[PDB]
Copies of this chain bind each other. A is one copy, B any other.
C-alpha cells in the first residue's frame, strides 16, 4: 500500500478523501475531532506543494445532519490558519475549473460528496470506477490520498472508485489506524479484553462471536444497549420501559443471536450487575438483584452502575490488550456519563496496549481530558467491521491500487 513518502506532490493535484462527517446539532458541527485527525496529512500535502482538493460526506440524504460542506470549509480554514475554499459542486464544470485554478500549497473542499446519487451507493470497484463522479474528477486530479478510515467499511465511488485509475495512497491517519487495530487484533499476549457498548447491537454481536470464536479476545465486557440486550438474553427482566425501548429499535431481533452467543461463550461475557435509571431527571442506581429493580419497569436505563464500572476497572487494569467501542450509557448527558468516564479512565490507566473507537457515539470524550489510551480511533462502524473480521473495502482498494501502479 502506497504511503505519502512514495510520491512527489509538488504541483500535483491531489484528491484527498477524508471523513469529516461530524456529529451536529441544529446543523452546526459539535466536534472537530475528525478534522484534527487529518491535519498531519493535510499539512504534509500543503508543505509538499500539492494542490489539495478535499472531499468528504456529511450525513446521508434526508438526515438531520445532512448539510453542505461550507462550515467544514471554515472549520478547516481555522485549524490550518489557511483559507480553504468551499467549492459548491462535486464533479461538474464549476468544480473542475475551480480545481484547475488551484496553485501549489492551496487547499479547497468540494460539496458534500453524498449530494451525488452515485456516491451514496455501495458498489463493486468495477462499477464505482465507471461513475460520472470518478470519470470526471479523474480528468483533473493526479493522485488520490485516502485518510477516511471511519468510512473504510463502505464501498462508495469516492472511496474505492479511483483505485485502478489513479494511484490511491494512504494518508497518515489511515496508516496509524490500520497499524494500531492490526496490532491489537493479532496480539499473542493476554488478557485481551474487549469492551462493547453503544447501540450498534447487531454489529457488536458479530464482533463478540468473531473475537471469541477465533480467540482474539479472552473476555468481553458490555455496556450501553449491547449490555441491555445481553442482560435480557441471560434471563433478567429489564422492565417494560426498557424492553419496549429495545423493541422500538428492533434490537429484540438480535436477542436471539445474543442468547446463542451466551450459550456458547457464557463464561467469557460480562454484563452489568447494576444500572442507573433516569428517575425524574435524577440519576438513580438500582441493583439487578436488589429490590429497587422494580424501578426498571417505569424508568429507563441510562448508564451502568458504580459497581459494574468498578468491576470492569479491575479487569481492564490487568489486561495486556484492550479493544473498546462505544459508550457505557447516555454519554452526552452529564449525569449519565459517569459509567463511560470511569471505564475509559480505567482503559487509560491500564498498562495495556489500548484502542478505543466509537465515532460519533463517543464524541463527548472531548470534555473529560482522558489521557493514556494508546490509540483512539476515529472509527465507529468501521472499527466494528474490522474486529468482526470483515474485509474493509477501502483497504482492499488501497491494496489493488498499489499492486496496479
Contacts and interface: CB of A to CB of B under 8 A. Distances in A.
A299 interface: no
A120 interface: yes
Interface of A: 61-62, 68, 88-89, 92-94, 111, 114-121, 123, 127, 131-132
Contacts of A120: 117
By Cβ-Cβ distance, the 3 closest A-B pairs, closest first, are: A94-B94, A88-B93, A88-B92
Nearest to A62: B127
Contacts of A93: 88-89, 94
Contacts of A111: 92
Contact of A132 (B68, B123, B131, B132): B68
Nearest to A128: B62
Contacts of A121: 61-62
A92 B86 CA distance: 12
A267 B127 CA distance: 48
17 contacts: A61-B118, A62-B118, A62-B121, A62-B127, A88-B92, A88-B93, A88-B94, A89-B92, A89-B93, A89-B94, A92-B94, A92-B111, A94-B94, A114-B117, A115-B116, A115-B118, A116-B116
Contacts of A117: 61, 114-117, 119-120
Given A92-B94, A114-B117, A117-B119, 20 more contacts: A61-B117, A61-B118, A61-B121, A61-B131, A62-B118, A62-B121, A62-B127, A62-B131, A68-B132, A88-B94, A89-B89, A89-B92, A89-B94, A92-B92, A92-B111, A94-B94, A115-B116, A115-B132, A116-B117, A117-B117
A111 B117 CA distance: 13
A132 B132 CA distance: 21
A93 B89 CA distance: 7
A108 to B, nearest CB: 13
A228 B62 CA distance: 41
